[PDB]
Amino acid sequence: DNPYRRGPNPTRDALTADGPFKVATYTVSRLSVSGFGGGVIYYPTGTSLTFGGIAMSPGYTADASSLAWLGRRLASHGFVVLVINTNSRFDGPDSRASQLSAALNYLRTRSPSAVRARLDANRLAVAGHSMGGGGTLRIAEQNPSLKAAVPLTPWHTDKTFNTSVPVLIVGAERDTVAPVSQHAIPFYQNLPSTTPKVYVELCNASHIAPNSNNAAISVYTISWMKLWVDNDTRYRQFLCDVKDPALCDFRTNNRHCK
Numbered sequence: 001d002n003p004y005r006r007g008p009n010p011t012r013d014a015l016t017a018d019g020p021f022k023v024a025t026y027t028v029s030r031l032s033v034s035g036f037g038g039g040v041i042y043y044p045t046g047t048s049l050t051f052g053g054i055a056m057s058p059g060y061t062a063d064a065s066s067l068a069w070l071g072r073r074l075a076s077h078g079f080v081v082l083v084i085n086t087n088s089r090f091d092g093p094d095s096r097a098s099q100l101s102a103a104l105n106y107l108r109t110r111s112p113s114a115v116r117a118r119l120d121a122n123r124l125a126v127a128g129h130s131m132g133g134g135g136t137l138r139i140a141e142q143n144p145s146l147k148a149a150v151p152l153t154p155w156h157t158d159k160t161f162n163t164s165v166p167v168l169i170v171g172a173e174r175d176t177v178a179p180v181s182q183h184a185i186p187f188y189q190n191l192p193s194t195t196p197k198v199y200v201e202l203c204n205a206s207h208i209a210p211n212s213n214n215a216a217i218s219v220y221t222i223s224w225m226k227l228w229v230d231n232d233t234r235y236r237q238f239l240c241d242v243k244d245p246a247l248c249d250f251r252t253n254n255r256h257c258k
Contacts, residue, residue: 004230006078016215019077022046035102037085039064042075052123052229053080055103057096059130066211080119093156096135140165148228152210160190168198168224172205201249216246
């Protein structure tokens with residue numbers, strides 16, 4: 001019925017580990033691409049199907065290795081995932097937006113044949129950490145054709161993003177870098193009331209929670225990407241009536257549950 005469904009029926013536990021797709025990697029050198037600093041593509045192998053694509057930005061001073069676990073994790077559940085390096089590690093949030101745009105255009109038009117073979121260029125999404133999460137919100141405003149956006153412990157000096165793209169923000173309760181009271185929560189609240197939106201707040205977590213294997217980040221990120229990129233309603237169950245002891249807050253306008 002849904003041509004985009006991939007993988008077996010999910011359980012929560014399965015979404016805390018790598019998924020059913022073997023993962024191939026391709027390193028994109030900085031000098032081979034224009035408009036961003038290269039990165040690493042994580043993509044399914046051992047399959048003849050196609051999948052949505054995700055461009056993901058690390059944060060300020062960080063490189064793509066800071067999100068390697070999550071690029072791999074997403075790809076292993078059935079996505080083509082480019083974790084970018086930026087032109088400079090010091091680039092700001094709006095520069096990271098522009099570089100995610102470049103990276104998406106790259107993925108759709110100039111990626112290697114084995115990567116392009118696995119990509120449905122009509123189904124793209126974004127995610128990012130810290131200033132990369134600020135860039136995720138900005139590109140979502142700029143590009144309403146994106147299917148989903150997942151800002152992880154985001155940072156931006158602008159607080160109101162005018163996007164219709166479904167957004168799930170992950171905040172870290174004890175973040176002192178991008179405090180949730182100043183960043184994540186304002187971002188959530190200021191999104192349009194008509195845009196599907198979720199805020200999950202990790203109990204006891206620091207700003208760097210996204211930089212290593214994290215069950216909650218895995219569950220929510222996979223689930224939001226599945227629901228919106230693949231229209232896979234088998235993942236609604238993880239995003240509605242949410243009962244998770246790893247979370248100390250959870251807010252939504254419930255547009256994806258009704």
